[PDB]
Amino acid sequence: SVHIEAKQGEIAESILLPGDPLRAKYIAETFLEDVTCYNNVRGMLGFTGTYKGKRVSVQGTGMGVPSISIYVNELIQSYGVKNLIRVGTCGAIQKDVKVRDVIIAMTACTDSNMNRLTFPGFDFAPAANFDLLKKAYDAGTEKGLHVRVGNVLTADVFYRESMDMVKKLGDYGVLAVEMETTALYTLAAKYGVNALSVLTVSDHIFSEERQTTFNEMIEIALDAAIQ
Amino acid sequence: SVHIEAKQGEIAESILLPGDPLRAKYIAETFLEDVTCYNNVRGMLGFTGTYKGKRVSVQGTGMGVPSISIYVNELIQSYGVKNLIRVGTCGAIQKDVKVRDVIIAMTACTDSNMNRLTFPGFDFAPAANFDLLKKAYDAGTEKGLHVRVGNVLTADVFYRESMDMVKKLGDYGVLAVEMETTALYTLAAKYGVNALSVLTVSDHIFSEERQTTFNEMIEIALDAAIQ
Amino acid sequence: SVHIEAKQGEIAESILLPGDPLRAKYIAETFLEDVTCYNNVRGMLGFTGTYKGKRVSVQGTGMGVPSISIYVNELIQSYGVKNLIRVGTCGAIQKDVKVRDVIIAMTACTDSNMNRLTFPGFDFAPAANFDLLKKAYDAGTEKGLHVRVGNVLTADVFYRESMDMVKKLGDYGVLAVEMETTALYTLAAKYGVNALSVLTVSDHIFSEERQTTFNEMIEIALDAAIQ
Amino acid sequence: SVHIEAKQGEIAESILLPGDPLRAKYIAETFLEDVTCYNNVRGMLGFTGTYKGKRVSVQGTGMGVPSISIYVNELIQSYGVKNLIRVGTCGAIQKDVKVRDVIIAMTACTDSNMNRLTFPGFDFAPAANFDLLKKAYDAGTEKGLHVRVGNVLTADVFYRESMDMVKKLGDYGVLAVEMETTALYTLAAKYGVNALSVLTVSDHIFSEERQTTFNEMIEIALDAAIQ
Amino acid sequence: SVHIEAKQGEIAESILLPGDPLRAKYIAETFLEDVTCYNNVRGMLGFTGTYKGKRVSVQGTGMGVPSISIYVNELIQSYGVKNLIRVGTCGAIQKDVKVRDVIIAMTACTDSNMNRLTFPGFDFAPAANFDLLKKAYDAGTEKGLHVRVGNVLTADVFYRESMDMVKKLGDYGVLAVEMETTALYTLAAKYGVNALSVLTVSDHIFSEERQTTFNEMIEIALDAAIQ
Amino acid sequence: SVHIEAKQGEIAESILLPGDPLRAKYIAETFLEDVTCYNNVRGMLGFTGTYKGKRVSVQGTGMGVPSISIYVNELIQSYGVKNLIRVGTCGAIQKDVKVRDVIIAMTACTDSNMNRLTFPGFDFAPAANFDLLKKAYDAGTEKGLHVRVGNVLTADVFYRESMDMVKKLGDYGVLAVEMETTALYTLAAKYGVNALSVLTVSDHIFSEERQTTFNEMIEIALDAAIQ
């Protein structure tokens, strides 16, 4: 495809989607066997290998709705990908959310215009695939993680001049802020495929220090993927 | 309160919220014991009684975001209600959704302006309480119902001149259209209380004939409430 | 129709539209002769009878743009109704407006999205039928009422977190806030029929205690209707 | 003021506001006695004289919301003007509106952003002063004119690429299109003064040939002004 | 055309566009030879004459996007005009911009809705013709003027209740506020013709006293026009 | 900073900003001497070296407004960068724009919401620094390149369902589509620093095959930077 140099068939139907391509490399090296690298265009590493005997891929997305939209469109439309699980970081914005919590996004709020363009006059609420959500939730519960299922903010603007609205969203239960989920969930819904975002809380708005938790999160995402 | 003539303490902390006040009367008569009627202002019947020994209420909301917002604000702010479960009807707009399916709304899209006023520049995605959602889903699964967990449209406009956008939403996986969930979920989040919408599919866009399914739905909503 | 169980011909071409269905019952019992009740679906009482020898109806609408839109669409499109007069309550938001004043809405402002959907990029100003307006104004003047003809706000949100905008509207002469007029006036214009809203001021933002004034208002609305 | 070179006291408290400054000159020459010209800045002629013994002014406004807003702000804030009556032309957009009809605007729709800036999230419906409206309506009725009281569109865009929305507005009863009323009515409301627009229909979208009708219109506007 | 009484061929392909028609008269009298006046409709004077032997026109536009849009549409579509240079005034809103500076607008911000109607969901940035821009910049540099090339605000609202946003725009480098450029640049782009705005700073937000600078500006605009 | 692991002083005050970090590596290897790599966080390579004896940096930005905003905010606020020149690719959307043309963006249109959040009710037109623009234009003219100075679209959505609006923008002279310029220009203006985007046309909507042109573009960007 335009931004992925893989041949047809090189990318598995289930894929993990970190924002950081170097985390894709870490995931492939740490968890997968029989690994190949199918992409290095723009340094946006993608790998395919096996986990517990099942073929799976891991693909960096970059940061922000426009970047992840490119990769997700290409993966779905050009490579036949069916199960897409973002594995990322986020910043807590609700008072009771703690560093190293795992957040499974049911839905996402956004300051992006991407859905207002598509659905003028409407507020589109992008929704997780419930099947994947339940699988990841059950896996994380079994593994003994602090898992929080709820709402997140997908932000275009990492550095805001005013945080009043972000605080207000936290007052309405929005758990954390990240930069991808609205696009992943919307595009998966568009194409009738299955998406989920699983996030580790890395800081509070108002990699080795979370490597163990991060590993456990990757494990439940892979678990939900290989089912 | 302004629209509810109940004394303090007369309304239980868990409440079912049909749109039709006559369905509130039906629910009270059919399922509850030791029933009283605490409201008839505007004919918007509300009742309190016991179910499997636990005190619960049932309150009509009327149709539309503005009507349900009035009742939900008063219930939460004036009567200390903590668990609110809408039990309603909806019209299918996604091709695979069938009449008599039960839909548990994870989130809701809307053509209402109510959240754009509160969060200018943002798309707010109102989210169910996951705890209640899981309880209702597990109850409906155990009971052998066709339960679908996903996205719904909360519409201001029942009679639209153009259905192009509603069709487009169905193409993005939105299951059905109803007229309340955005407000219930948003207000519950605002006040830190717990909400869910459970809906029976009554027709396809493109009461006795569903009384058995409707009863089973009321049963899982009560089950999720009394836990 | 979907929400009205009347047979063809049971609803008169002129109709009064209180928000409260119990006020429809009061109006029918107090003012009309040879009364029948043609609807009790959702408790939304509707009646037909005679006033000064002329056949007229009275139909509850519920609260809010979405609720009244349902009823008005059905009345116009399924029952051939031609003259529709809302008879309601409102809250004063302009300093000189007093409790028990009668307000005849020339037009309405709104926080609803219903007209932005229909006319993207435009501000639609819903207008009363001038003929009905003049008839009601002349009747109220003759009857010796305090009648104020002007602008109102049709609100989706009865309980607002911030009242800054409502105050600002009052500073621009908007008289009072209610929850229906934008929809009534817009739909009547759409279908080429005649609408008016006549309102009693029940409180100031910043039923027996107004029963005499309320009666006098019902009288001028009926007068404007039977002409 | 910035755009009017008049001394304090030179402009009367009642003023007619044609868009065309040469029509201000025509009105002054044809109807007024003891006339002076108080402004020629930007050629935007303004005059003061007497009509039926009462002092009145006539001031060009130019075309469009931004131009008339300048003049109306200055007249109200710097010159103490209290009664402002636009006397203009318009193009019919509703099928039953005829050339040479006189339209008295109750309210105005707009494609301008001027009120969305002031009232974010709201649709502001600018309203005529009813007192002036009634006076002009009664005068025009007595004079035997075809007077139509209703809604108009205040357009920013005289030459539109697509007229679909203008046609749709006509289908919702909007009578004609002009380029000033939203601003006049909004600013008059802001400052607690009295405004009206009286318009002659000059063409149908889909000066000597209307000089007699135009004169009769000027006469009723002056009549409403001198009361 | 509707607002210009010129015959075909009477208006030159290059035209200067002051807002003030009396400045059009000044320009024609001061700079042009063999002058005729081709329009006085609405007092909006237009002239054609010769400058350094080349035929050129000068046409008032009035104030505001809607007024200039009318004239520019007619000039382009009915009179075949190809090079359009606004020569106007502006108010400084950025701290380093001085009275009598000449500002050449690269682009313009706006509070107008005119481009949101045409490009829903997009921010359209109207751009100068670079060829004309370079010619005017080089001419002004040669002439020894203080020329500033940058961003301006095209305002609908000359008298704003709050100047917070205007100050914020100045903090983002927007140089000055005026009332025409967005429309001129957008319409020229629509029709594939060439536009520029050259402005003299007349005051700071937070004719003889600038007649020399104003003349020098007219000179560089004519220079850019006759090339 | 959060996304750049450089020490204070390691990044030069003038920087080139390709979207592709591997193009940053190419630029450093091909054009710069005495090179170090100061960042590999997220694979987003950044380098500092010397060009014609002057210290300069080159930093990947990733794709899309949110990604480039992160890097530009950090470069300006944490590293004291003063001159920022994007060197990127774009797709032609105006009929006369050719592959391998160099486009220097005067301004940018966008489908992003980033400026509507900051300037509610306004269209913000992000503007290039004219000084840098002129330097790059003069350098490209001297070098004999096809340089086009004009408007571009900064898109969030690379894969659009409907291209109607993109075509319409091309009809209004918008030259090409890319995914960064609005953010670069807006943030540079916010902080009072200097930005420009220079783009090579890589395809038409409706790396070695452009390596020579791409090199020439890098050369003029470096030229404009080292002045």
From Swiss-Prot, chains A, B, C, D, E, F:
Origin: domain of life: Bacteria
The UniProt entry, under InterPro entries, shows: DeoD-type, Nucleoside_phosphorylase_CS, Nucleoside_phosphorylase_d, Nucleoside_phosphorylase_sf
Keywords attached to this Swiss-Prot or TrEMBL record, sorted alphabetically, are: Glycosyltransferase, Transferase
Q: Which Pfam families match?
A: PNP_UDP_1 (PF01048)
Gene Ontology cellular-component terms for this entry are:
cytosol
Q: What class of enzyme is it?
A: transferase
Q: Which residues bind phosphate?
A: 19, 23, 42, 86-89
Q: A GO term (biological process) for this protein? A: purine nucleoside catabolic process
Under Gene Ontology molecular function, one entry of this record is: purine-nucleoside phosphorylase activity
Write out the catalysed reaction: a purine D-ribonucleoside + phosphate = a purine nucleobase + alpha-D-ribose 1-phosphate; a purine 2'-deoxy-D-ribonucleoside + phosphate = a purine nucleobase + 2-deoxy-alpha-D-ribose 1-phosphate
EC number in record: 2.4.2.1
Q: Where is this site: Important for catalytic activity?
A: 210
What does the entry list as the binding residues for a purine D-ribonucleoside?
A: 3, 161, 178-180, 202-203
Q: Which residues form the active site?
A: 203
Query: Which family would the database say this protein is a member of?
Result: Belongs to the PNP/UDP phosphorylase family.
Q: How does it assemble?
A: Homohexamer; trimer of homodimers.
The cross-references to PANTHER family, in alphabetical order and at most eight, read:
FI09636P-RELATED, URIDINE PHOSPHORYLASE
| Protein function | Catalyzes the reversible phosphorolytic breakdown of the N-glycosidic bond in the beta-(deoxy)ribonucleoside molecules, with the formation of the corresponding free purine bases and pentose-1-phosphate.
Stated name of the protein: Purine nucleoside phosphorylase DeoD-type
Organism, by scientific name, is Bacillus cereus
